[PDB]
Design an enzyme around this catalytic site. Structure first.
Site, PDB file in Angstrom:
ATOM      1  N   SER A  61     -25.784  76.167  58.842  1.00 31.12           N
ATOM      2  CA  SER A  61     -24.975  75.402  57.787  1.00 31.12           C
ATOM      3  C   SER A  61     -25.371  75.759  56.423  1.00 31.12           C
ATOM      4  O   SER A  61     -24.598  75.363  55.436  1.00 31.12           O
ATOM      5  CB  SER A  61     -25.847  74.122  57.886  1.00 31.12           C
ATOM      6  OG  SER A  61     -25.485  73.475  59.030  1.00 31.12           O
ATOM      7  N   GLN A 117     -21.535  66.810  65.225  1.00 29.95           N
ATOM      8  CA  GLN A 117     -20.761  67.881  66.021  1.00 29.95           C
ATOM      9  C   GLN A 117     -19.473  67.536  66.420  1.00 29.95           C
ATOM     10  O   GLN A 117     -19.207  66.355  66.800  1.00 29.95           O
ATOM     11  CB  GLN A 117     -21.801  68.250  67.018  1.00 29.95           C
ATOM     12  CG  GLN A 117     -23.209  68.462  66.505  1.00 29.95           C
ATOM     13  CD  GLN A 117     -24.258  67.675  67.531  1.00 29.95           C
ATOM     14  OE1 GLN A 117     -24.250  66.677  67.641  1.00 29.95           O
ATOM     15  NE2 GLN A 117     -25.337  68.791  67.782  1.00 29.95           N
ATOM     16  N   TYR A 147     -24.589  63.367  57.188  1.00 32.53           N
ATOM     17  CA  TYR A 147     -24.449  64.531  57.324  1.00 32.53           C
ATOM     18  C   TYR A 147     -23.794  65.053  58.585  1.00 32.53           C
ATOM     19  O   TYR A 147     -23.948  64.587  59.565  1.00 32.53           O
ATOM     20  CB  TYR A 147     -25.630  65.488  57.029  1.00 32.53           C
ATOM     21  CG  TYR A 147     -25.596  66.628  57.303  1.00 32.53           C
ATOM     22  CD1 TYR A 147     -25.951  67.439  58.573  1.00 32.53           C
ATOM     23  CD2 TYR A 147     -25.362  67.597  56.268  1.00 32.53           C
ATOM     24  CE1 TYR A 147     -26.037  68.970  58.735  1.00 32.53           C
ATOM     25  CE2 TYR A 147     -25.290  68.820  56.320  1.00 32.53           C
ATOM     26  CZ  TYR A 147     -25.681  69.558  57.349  1.00 32.53           C
ATOM     27  OH  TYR A 147     -25.715  70.934  57.242  1.00 32.53           O
ATOM     28  N   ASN A 149     -20.981  68.254  60.761  1.00 34.07           N
ATOM     29  CA  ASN A 149     -19.965  69.433  60.440  1.00 34.07           C
ATOM     30  C   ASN A 149     -18.383  68.924  60.569  1.00 34.07           C
ATOM     31  O   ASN A 149     -17.627  69.638  60.036  1.00 34.07           O
ATOM     32  CB  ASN A 149     -20.301  70.250  61.924  1.00 34.07           C
ATOM     33  CG  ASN A 149     -21.627  70.886  62.041  1.00 34.07           C
ATOM     34  OD1 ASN A 149     -22.310  71.047  60.756  1.00 34.07           O
ATOM     35  ND2 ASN A 149     -22.162  71.218  63.000  1.00 34.07           N
ATOM     36  N   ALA A 315     -29.248  76.170  60.177  1.00 34.67           N
ATOM     37  CA  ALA A 315     -29.855  76.633  61.298  1.00 34.67           C
ATOM     38  C   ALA A 315     -28.642  76.699  62.490  1.00 34.67           C
ATOM     39  O   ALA A 315     -27.674  76.279  62.248  1.00 34.67           O
ATOM     40  CB  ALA A 315     -30.702  75.509  61.956  1.00 34.67           C
ATOM     41  N   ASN A 340     -35.233  79.266  64.522  1.00 35.32           N
ATOM     42  CA  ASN A 340     -34.950  78.062  64.020  1.00 35.32           C
ATOM     43  C   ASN A 340     -36.277  77.171  63.869  1.00 35.32           C
ATOM     44  O   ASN A 340     -36.570  76.445  64.611  1.00 35.32           O
ATOM     45  CB  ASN A 340     -33.962  77.283  64.672  1.00 35.32           C
ATOM     46  CG  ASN A 340     -33.467  75.717  63.965  1.00 35.32           C
ATOM     47  OD1 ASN A 340     -33.988  75.587  63.125  1.00 35.32           O
ATOM     48  ND2 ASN A 340     -32.850  74.884  64.893  1.00 35.32           N
TER      49      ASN A 340
HETATM   50  B1  LIG Z   1     -26.376  73.092  60.014  1.00 37.61           B
HETATM   51  O1  LIG Z   1     -26.958  71.733  59.457  1.00 37.61           O
HETATM   52  O2  LIG Z   1     -27.205  73.909  60.254  1.00 37.61           O
HETATM   53  C1  LIG Z   1     -25.763  72.784  61.641  1.00 37.61           C
HETATM   54  N1  LIG Z   1     -25.399  73.786  62.337  1.00 37.61           N
HETATM   55  C2  LIG Z   1     -25.046  74.151  63.640  1.00 37.61           C
HETATM   56  O3  LIG Z   1     -24.348  73.014  63.940  1.00 37.61           O
HETATM   57  C3  LIG Z   1     -24.985  75.334  64.444  1.00 37.61           C
HETATM   58  C4  LIG Z   1     -25.632  75.115  65.678  1.00 37.61           C
HETATM   59  C5  LIG Z   1     -25.309  75.635  66.873  1.00 37.61           C
HETATM   60  C6  LIG Z   1     -26.398  75.341  67.684  1.00 37.61           C
HETATM   61  C7  LIG Z   1     -27.372  74.599  67.190  1.00 37.61           C
HETATM   62  S1  LIG Z   1     -27.241  74.511  65.631  1.00 37.61           S
HETATM   63  C8  LIG Z   1     -26.118  71.762  62.276  1.00 37.61           C
HETATM   64  C9  LIG Z   1     -25.918  70.615  62.241  1.00 37.61           C
HETATM   65  C10 LIG Z   1     -26.204  69.356  63.166  1.00 37.61           C
HETATM   66  C11 LIG Z   1     -27.570  69.806  64.137  1.00 37.61           C
HETATM   67  C12 LIG Z   1     -27.710  71.171  63.938  1.00 37.61           C
HETATM   68  C13 LIG Z   1     -27.398  71.848  63.205  1.00 37.61           C
END
Ligand SMILES: *[B]([O])([O])[C]([N]C(=O)[C]C1=[C][C]=[C]S1)C1=[C][C]=[C][C]=[C]1
Ligand SMILES: [K+]
Length: 358
Positions: A61, A117, A147, A149, A315, A340
């Protein structure tokens, strides 16, 4: 490096790596505007490949800061306005909950509870429209931050539509290339695979899997050198020769909403400095709980405040990243790891380093 920087970095990071069992890590400190680089451990445990200044890490992120600046650049070009309805750029979004949801809301996680997500079953453009049409907001627009994505991801996809470029092409031409981020990628080319660290989750080597709106939300890979250059660019936007990109950076650190001690930018998040790490943790997405928080509109947004702690965590399944900088001190840090590990530990380390040096 100056011994004070050497010492606080090693004295902070070595115990962090031990505590968190991090396989490999790269750190950059930007001090008086010069970068200083540090590396430990392994990019690839099985192949015994060390972390170097050329190693690519998944930013997760932290990618949202690029998305926010790219969107800022599009505003500066006059291609989009944050006050625009979402439907101006996606008229197929005809479901009535979209009435009143602007690009600003998407960019700042305030549309009314877009989910964290995008579901893995969303595979096609058709699927993605169906997802957004079917989504039922919990809240009116502009009342709570959650928050997500799916929020800033959609912002990024829409922001580039007037340009006629794909998101990746727009990012390359308009952000990476002007800033000389020549080892920063949405899609890692075959020629660069020798540099691409493995992430580690439960001791297994992993890379991020494809997903809808991945480029926009979590899909950038970069080196410690390019990330130090990204921090320098965000610390000192007035040294950027490309006027829309300079303006874009400034728009991304504007303060649009407040929740507690935290101010929401475009990708970036900010607090006033001075501030202590427990207050940063609770004032950010660095906390372990998924929080719906009421927000106050900042009407109109405050231009980028120099006295700020500007930051973003990121992450992926196998990687953990953190960036923080303080413009009025010409000071910043990047921490890239191929595990992570908990966000509070990132902020604690970052604060320990930056406060020692400021
Ligand atoms: B971010 O806040 O780091 C975001 N990252 C991701 O969605 C990428 C990932 C793929 C698999 C695990 S993390 C995030 C949003 C919500 C939860 C975790 C990470
Ligand atoms: K995608």
């Amino acid at each position: 490096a100056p011994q004070q920087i050497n010492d606080i970095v090693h004295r902070t990071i070595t115990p962090l790596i031990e505590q968190q069992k991090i396989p490999g890590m790269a750190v950059a400190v930007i001090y008086q505007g010069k970068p200083y680089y540090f590396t430990w451990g392994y990019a690839d445990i099985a192949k015994k490949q060390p972390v170097t200044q050329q190693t690519l890490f998944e930013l997760g992120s932290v990618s949202k800061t690029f998305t926010g600046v790219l969107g800022g650049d599009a505003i500066a070009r006059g291609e989009i306005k944050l006050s625009d309805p979402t439907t101006k750029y996606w008229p197929e979004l005809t479901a009535k909950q979209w009435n009143g949801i602007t690009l600003l809301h998407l960019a700042t996680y305030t549309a009314g509870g877009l989910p964290l997500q995008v579901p893995d079953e969303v595979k096609s453009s058709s699927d993605l429209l169906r997802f957004y049409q079917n989504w039922q907001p919990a809240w009116a627009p502009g009342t709570q931050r959650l928050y997500a994505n799916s929020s800033i991801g959609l912002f990024g996809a829409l922001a580039v539509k007037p340009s006629g470029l794909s998101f990746e092409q727009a990012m390359q031409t308009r952000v990476f290339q002007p800033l000389k981020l020549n080892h920063t990628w949405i899609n890692v080319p075959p020629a660069e695979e020798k540099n691409y660290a493995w992430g580690y989750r439960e001791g297994k080597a992993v890379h991020v899997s494809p997903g809808a709106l991945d480029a926009e939300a979590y899909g950038v890979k970069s080196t410690i050198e390019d990330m130090a250059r990204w921090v320098q660019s965000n610390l000192k936007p007035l040294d950027i020769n490309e006027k829309t990109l300079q303006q874009g950076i400034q728009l991304a650190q504007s303060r649009y909403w407040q929740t507690g001690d935290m101010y929401q930018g475009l990708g970036w998040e900010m607090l006033d400095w001075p501030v202590n790490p427990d207050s940063i943790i609770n004032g950010s997405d660095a906390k372990i709980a998924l929080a719906a928080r009421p927000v106050k509109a900042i009407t109109p947004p405050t231009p980028a405040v120099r006295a700020s702690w500007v930051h973003k965590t990121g992450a992926t399944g196998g990687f953990g990243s953190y960036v923080a900088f303080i413009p009025e001190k010409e000071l910043g840090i990047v921490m890239l790891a191929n595990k992570n590990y908990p966000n509070p530990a990132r902020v604690d380390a970052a604060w320990q380093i930056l406060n020692a040096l400021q």
